[PDB]
Design a protein around this ligand. Structure first.
Ligand SMILES: COc1cccc(-n2c(N)c(C(N)=O)c3nc4ccccc4nc32)c1
Length: 266
């Protein structure tokens, strides 16, 4: 993490509440004098040394990644207070809340573009040996041009083997990605709705899966089912997912084929 000079940071408005303090939007002046929009997280006054370590830990992890679909760390402020993390700004906020405002208003190709971006970011994360463990639409940010980026460095999003015995792998992230795919095509519906956690676990283990979202292309529902294979070795790798979505983008016509209990037994 680059140490930023605090005189280069302006804080304009509060846009959210974080675990360790406020989230704000603002501006950062780069060494080149270019001014960019940024998000700013501040560590709350009177922090404990553990809180400081956990706070800055996110920056340490995020700083290892340089990719168009991973939130960009601009730097940190530690030598003055409040302590701060500064990232690129994403005008349209969290993906799930954004889609909920626009139910059925985007084209399939727009949605597939979002999904391809998320998959590309995950492909790089997994390439780097990072298992996210919290991949969910609420942890994806989306900017003014609808570019989606992985952020946040959860039973409904977690693979059965990770729930069963903490077997977290890039293949359990692929499971989570399948859930994100369902979330996106459902415009931010909650996975498994408000089912009791114990029933989500039992149903999924028994082979039940989320149903196809309204007007969901068959190709995309099949990709969900592939991400949700019980045997994690049968799930696609993220490189394959990116390839699949790139084909659908290249062949928009294929997206026109559309797909007892709420959940379906696969
Ligand atoms: C500045 O440090 C970080 C680290 C991780 C995520 C974010 N982060 C951003 N870059 C955001 C943005 N809109 O650009 C944003 N909106 C948020 C809204 C609500 C809660 C947390 C948020 N968190 C946010 C900011």
């Amino acid at each position: 993490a680059k140490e930023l000079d605090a005189t280069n940071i302006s804080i304009d408005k509060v846009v959210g509440a974080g675990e360790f303090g406020e989230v704000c939007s603002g501006r950062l002046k780069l060494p080149s004098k270019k001014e960019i929009s940024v998000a700013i997280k501040t560590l709350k006054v009177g922090y404990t040394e553990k809180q400081r370590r956990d706070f800055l830990g996110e920056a340490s992890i995020m700083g290892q990644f340089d990719h168009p679909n991973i939130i960009r760390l601009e730097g940190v402020v530690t030598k003055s207070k409040p302590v701060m993390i500064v990232t690129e700004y994403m005008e349209n906020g969290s993906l799930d809340s954004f889609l909920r405002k626009h139910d059925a208003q985007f084209t399939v190709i727009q949605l597939v573009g979002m999904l391809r971006g998320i998959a590309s970011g995950m492909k790089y994360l997994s390439d780097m040996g990072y298992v996210h463990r919290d991949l969910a639409a609420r942890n994806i940010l989306i900017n003014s041009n609808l570019v989606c980026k992985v952020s946040d460095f959860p039973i409904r999003w977690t693979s059965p083997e990770a729930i069963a015995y903490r077997k977290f792998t890039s293949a359990s992230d692929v499971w989570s990605y399948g859930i994100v795919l369902w979330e996106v095509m459902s415009y931010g519906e909650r996975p498994y709705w408000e089912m009791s956690n114990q029933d989500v676990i039992k149903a999924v283990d028994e082979g039940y899966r989320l149903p196809p979202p309204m007007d969901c292309p068959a190709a995309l529902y099949q990709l969900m089912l592939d991400c949700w294979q019980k045997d994690r070795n049968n799930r696609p790798k993220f490189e394959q997912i990116v390839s699949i979505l790139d084909k659908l983008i290249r062949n928009p016509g294929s997206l026109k084929i559309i797909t007892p209990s709420n959940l379906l037994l696969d």
